[PDB]
Design a protein around this nucleic acid. Structure first.
Lengths: 115, 115
DNA sequence: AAGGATCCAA
DNA sequence: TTGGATCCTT
DNA sequence: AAGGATCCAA
DNA sequence: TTGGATCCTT
C-alpha cells in the first residue's frame, strides 16, 4: 500500500550499504515505524517469545524477561528490540510486524529475503 | 446441551464396566455419534495427525496413511478409528470431537478425565 | 498379546 | 510442544 | 569482541 | 517444529 516506500528502501543505497543482518533489521523496523507509528505499535504488542520480551520502550524491560538478549538501542524511533536472534527469528519478527501492518505477502517475502 | 446424555453415560454401569481406556474411548465415540451423526461427522474431518489419518469409513484408509495404528473396528456406528495412541491423544481426539460439537468445556474436562 | 506409556522425530 | 509408533508392561 | 549460526529446552 | 541463548566465528 504505502509499502511502495518499503520498496524504495530495499532499493536504497543506504539499505544496500548495511552489511549486517542486525543492521538491515533495524533499518526495516525504523522505517516501518516511520510509516504508521500507530499500526507499528499495535503490531508490536502481539510480538514476543515464550519467555523473552521483544520490543519495549526501554532497555531494561528487555533485559529482565529473557536474559542474554541484546537490547539494541533505538531504532530511529521510540522502541528497543532484542538482537540475540538468528536471522530466521529476525525474519519472522518482520513477517509479523508486516502482516499486522497489511503489507502484501508478496513484499513480505522479498523483504524477509534481503535480511 | 444434549450433553446430559453424555453425563448419563459417564455414570452408567456400562461405561463403568470397561476397564481399559480404549474401551471407554470407543464407547464415547460410539455414544457421541449416536447423538448427532451429522455434527460428529463434521467434527471428525478436522481431526488428524501430521501424517496418520484418525477417523475413516473403512479399515484400509487407516492402515495406509500412518503405519502401526490399530484400526479398531467400528464403534457401534460407521467409522473406523486409530487406536495406537496413548491416553493423552485419546483425549484430545475427544476434546476435539467435543468442542466442535459444542459441549461445555466443563463436561469435556470431566469426560476426558474418565478415559 | 493387547494396550499404552515412553521415547524419538518434526 | 505436538505427533508417530516403538516397545516395555500397567 | 558484535553478529548470528548452531544447538539445545519446550 | 518453535523459541532461547550459548558459543563458534562469517
Amino acid at each position: 500500500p504505502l509499502g511502495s516506500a518499503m520498496r524504495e528502501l530495499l532499493l536504497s543505497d543506504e539499505y544496500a550499504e548495511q552489511k549486517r543482518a542486525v543492521n538491515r533489521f533495524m533499518l526495516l523496523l525504523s522505517t516501518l515505524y516511520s510509516l504508521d507509528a500507530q499500526a507499528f505499535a499495535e503490531a508490536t504488542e502481539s510480538l514476543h517469545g515464550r519467555t523473552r520480551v521483544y520490543f519495549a520502550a526501554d532497555e531494561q524491560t528487555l533485559l529482565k524477561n529473557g536474559n542474554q538478549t541484546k537490547p539494541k538501542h533505538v531504532p530511529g524511533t521510540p522502541y528497543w528490540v532484542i538482537t540475540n536472534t538468528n536471522t530466521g527469528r529476525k525474519c519472522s519478527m518482520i513477517e509479523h510486524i508486516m502482516q499486522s501492518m497489511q503489507f502484501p505477502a508478496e513484499l513480505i517475502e522479498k523483504v524477509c529475503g534481503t535480511i
